[PDB]
């Protein structure tokens, strides 16, 4: 197939990480968010995918032309000089997706799932309409684009991005199958795919919904990032149990890179993922944290529900709790308490942060 990943740009939710490395390239459980999408697309039988970049295409495009020869699919790229949003690159890639009379995957760059591409496209050809989206159930549907799905077939009766009256409960999972006839309909002027394309689609009865199996989360915020890595390590516990490193002093589900080491007398608590090249000293207690590439956590620290970015040096006797995100190459001094600290890249912290703040 063709597959169009609108890869975002400026990554404002989840900002301390995206201030150094773009949001498709920040490693979610030891490989980037785009890489999960494109390995599942290479397993799906998609022939070549295209990603709709607008921001930091240097490091992104150099990674894509690295792994184009490793996945064995042509990872083509739509460059933009200004951001076109969420329905603009639908119309920029009008020719590059209008060449075949075959459907194409439209994927959000930030959703991490247990994707069902076969289910989605071969549910799609059963009705053959203009668009077939993936839906998931959720507890607060006022943040995400809801749908009204009918019985046993799944026609989208209505579609609103923010319901605000509680029309219904199912929401956009962030993955669509679109037919090439919807391509030429909308114009190059930037707008939203959800406000205007899908809401006129539902007036016809050409939008469809496929109910997911489960484990959906979009990692836009660091809170959603840590809830998503909890659910991803749960999926690894269900399906591939040997991937998780469990040993004597390991508590719960831990995903460790082989290059990462861990000292003695430490307790690497439940739902932790350690990225590549990190070095963990002796006497720490790390629970619900992600530690990104080559970062250092010195002795006798206590880290909970926190993100430690690339080449950070968390000092000794350091407490961190409450979704404290560290940006790239942040040095935390000895015996400091950080509750909620979003810390800007290349900062050295010398004082305790007793309330959730941004440090710049």
């Amino acid at each position: 197939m063709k597959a169009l990943i609108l890869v975002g740009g400026y990554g404002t939710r989840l900002r301390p990480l995206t201030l150094s490395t773009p949001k498709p390239l920040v490693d979610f459980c030891n490989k980037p968010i785009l890489l999960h999408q494109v390995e599942a697309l290479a397993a799906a039988g998609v022939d070549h995918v295209i990603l709709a970049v607008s921001y930091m295409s240097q490091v992104l495009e150099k990674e894509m032309k690295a792994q184009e020869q490793r996945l064995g699919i042509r990872i083509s790229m739509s460059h933009e000089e200004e951001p076109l949003g969420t329905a603009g690159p639908l119309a920029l890639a009008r020719d590059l997706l209008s060449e075949t009379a075959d459907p194409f995957f439209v994927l959000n760059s930030d959703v991490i799932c247990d994707f069902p591409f076969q289910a989605m496209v071969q549910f799609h050809r059963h009705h053959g309409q203009e668009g077939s989206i993936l839906v998931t159930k959720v507890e607060e549907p006022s943040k995400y684009g809801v749908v009204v799905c009918e019985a046993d077939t799944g026609r989208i009766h209505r579609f609103v991005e923010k319901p605000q009256v509680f029309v219904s409960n199912k929401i956009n999972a962030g993955m669509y199958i679109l037919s090439p006839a919807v391509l030429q309909r909308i114009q190059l002027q930037p707008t939203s795919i959800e406000k205007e394309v899908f809401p006129i689609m539902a007036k016809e009865g050409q939008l469809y919904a496929m109910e997911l199996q489960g484990f959906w989360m979009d990692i836009g915020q660091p809170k959603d990032f840590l809830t998503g890595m909890c659910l991803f390590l749960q999926s690894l516990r269900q399906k591939q149990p040997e991937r998780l490193c469990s040993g004597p002093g390991i508590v719960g589900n831990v995903l460790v890179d082989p290059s990462a080491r861990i000292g003695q007398n430490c307790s690497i608590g439940p739902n932790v993922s350690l990225g590549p090249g990190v070095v963990v000293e002796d006497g720490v207690c790390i629970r619900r944290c992600t530690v990104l590439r080559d970062a250092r956590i010195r002795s006798h620290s206590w880290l909970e529900s926190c993100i430690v970015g690339w080449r950070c040096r968390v000092g000794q006797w350091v407490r961190m709790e409450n979704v404290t995100v560290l940006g790239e190459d942040v040095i935390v001094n000895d015996e400091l308490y950080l509750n909620g600290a979003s810390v800007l890249p290349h900062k050295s912290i010398g004082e305790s942060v007793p309330e959730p703040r941004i440090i710049m």
Partner: protein
């Protein structure tokens, strides 16, 4: 022959959870452009066979009350009378005190309506259920959220015969998710238990209708329910009246399509449902967002942005102002580039059939951020932000206030 009784309150019993006004009576407060009880009077005068309309309350007869009575009598060609009680007699005590005025002419039934509700008013549907049933008390009930059911009168019914079996007025624990809407159809024999309550006390004449007649006569075959699906809200707070304004301007699309404001691209930009009085002057550069109601004689300047706001009569908004989630009182002036902003008291959008919670002006010793109220003849200077504040009537401000009650 049918008649209608509207229980309007009185000066102290209004107990405004966050005040809609200070100087006009609470029944006469314009929700969606017309006074709050004129929705009841429209709904009652639409019913065939309705002869009379009675307002029972303990307001003294001021001039707005009398001129509203005359305006309603002239507009609907019905008698609209105001029977004033000698004391606050409660919800059923005024019905028992005025039972000779209520039962004069021998009506077939009478509707009892709380003044502070916004309703669809399915009076013919309740009338048809009662003409088939012929029972002493018929109640309109809606369906509540499980958490929010504790703030209303909850009803354990029998779903085969529609008979109330248990009634609790304001519970502390959940007994039901059916709630009393405040709309009743009374047979001319329903005054006969009310007498009984009076004679329990005389062994003056206060009778709580829900706590003495509904809570104690349930399960006895006397009270029946009529479940409804339409719009229903209680109007107690200021945000409750803005919500009632939104509901009524939604219902105006199929009842009063003349009352809404169309675009008319020589004139002001209209988003959503907007009521503008025909006498209001709205400059063509002013864009009027959804759920805006403009009273008579209101002057709106150029570039004014009005969103979810009631602007009462005589008020002047000068140029470039932004009024959001506010009740600009009558005769109030907002000067150039002033921003009068409030916080919306919106129902929980993740949950089915959350009705509305009405804010109580103070949660735990802190002031709650809610709708901004400007009193009557309040002057807002130019280039000033009023945020989540109540400005008391006749007060010329000079600086920007934020989360205050400015006396």
């Amino acid at each position: 022959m049918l008649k209608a009784v509207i229980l309007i309150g009185g000066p102290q019993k209004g107990t405004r959870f966050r005040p809609l006004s200070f100087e006009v009576p609470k029944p006469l407060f314009p929700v969606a452009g017309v006074p709050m009880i004129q929705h009841h009077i429209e709904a009652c005068a639409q019913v065939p066979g309705m002869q009379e309309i009675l307002l029972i309350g303990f307001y003294q007869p001021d001039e707005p009350l009398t001129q509203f009575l005359e305006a309603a009598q002239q507009e609907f060609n019905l008698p609209v009378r105001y029977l004033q009680e000698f004391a606050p007699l409660g919800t059923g005590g005024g019905l028992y005190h005025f039972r000779d005025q209520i039962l004069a002419g021998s009506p077939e039934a009478f509707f009892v309506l709380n003044a502070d509700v916004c309703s669809d008013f399915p009076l013919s549907a309740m009338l048809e259920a009662h003409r088939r049933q012929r029972h002493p008390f018929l109640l309109l009930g809606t369906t509540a959220n499980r958490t929010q059911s504790l703030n209303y009168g909850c009803i354990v019914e029998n779903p085969q015969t529609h008979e109330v079996l248990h009634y609790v007025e304001k519970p502390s624990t959940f007994i039901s998710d059916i709630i009393n809407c405040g709309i009743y159809l009374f047979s001319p024999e329903a005054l006969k238990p009310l007498r009984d309550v009076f004679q329990r006390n005389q062994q003056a004449g206060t009778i709580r209708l829900e706590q003495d007649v509904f809570s104690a006569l349930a399960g006895q075959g006397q009270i029946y329910v009529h479940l409804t699906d339409g719009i229903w809200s209680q109007i107690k707070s200021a945000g409750s009246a803005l919500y009632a304004s939104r509901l009524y301007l939604s219902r105006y699309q199929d009842t009063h399509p003349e009352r809404l404001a169309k675009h008319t691209p020589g004139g002001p930009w209209i988003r959503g449902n907007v009521y503008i009085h025909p006498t209001a002057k709205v400059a063509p550069s002013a864009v009027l967002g959804p759920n805006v109601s403009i009273g008579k004689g209101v002057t709106v300047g150029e570039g004014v942005r009005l969103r979810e706001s009631i602007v009462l009569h005589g008020a002047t908004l000068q140029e470039h102002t932004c009024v959001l989630h506010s009740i600009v009182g009558w005769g109030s002036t907002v000067g150039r580039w002033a921003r009068v902003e409030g916080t919306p008291s919106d129902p929980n959008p993740n949950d089915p059939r959350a009705r509305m919670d009405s804010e109580s002006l103070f949660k735990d010793g802190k002031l709650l951020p809610a709708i901004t109220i400007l009193g009557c003849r309040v002057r807002i200077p130019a280039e000033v932000l009023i945020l989540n504040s109540i400005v008391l009537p006749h007060k010329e401000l000079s600086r920007s206030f934020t989360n205050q009650i400015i006396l």
